[PDB]
């Protein structure tokens, strides 16, 4: 399923997480977004208890996109200890996301 995060739950779900966080930025109008949705869901289950994963619809939470200067999607952001550690744009393969995840673990 992957939990949704927005402007109001951001600080609590992402910035105060005790574990590395992977956030998927998407929007209904973006075709390529449908292509990584399966990978994000699979990785979330696959790494339960090890990392937190959320999805952020830019249509409904532009504030967050503005704070981190996100101007394009699909975008995947990684957070750790309250700090943004890396940003990836495009249709990212499951393998590349796994290297990054494994790095913050």
Curated annotation (Swiss-Prot):
Disulfide bonds: 30-33
Thioredoxin domain: residues covered: 1-105
Source organism, top-level taxon: Eukaryota
Catalytic residues (UniProt): 30, 33
Site (Contributes to redox potential value): 31-32
UniProt site positions, description: Deprotonates C-terminal active site Cys: 24
Residue stretches in coiled coil: none
The protein, known as: Thioredoxin M-type Md
Native source species: Spinacia oleracea
Segment of the intact protein contained: 75 to 179 of 181
């Amino acid at each position: 399923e992957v939990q949704d995060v927005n402007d109001s739950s951001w600080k609590e779900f992402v910035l105060e997480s005790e574990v590395p966080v992977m956030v998927d930025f998407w929007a209904p109008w973006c075709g390529p977004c449908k292509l990584i949705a399966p990978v994000i869901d699979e990785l979330a289950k696959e790494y339960s208890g090890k990392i937190a994963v959320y999805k952020l619809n830019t249509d409904e939470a532009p504030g967050i996109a503005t704070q981190y200067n996100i101007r394009s999607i699909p975008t995947v952001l990684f957070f750790k200890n309250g700090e943004r550690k890396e940003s990836i744009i495009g249709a990212v393969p499951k393998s590349t996301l796994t290297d990054s995840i494994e790095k913050y673990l």
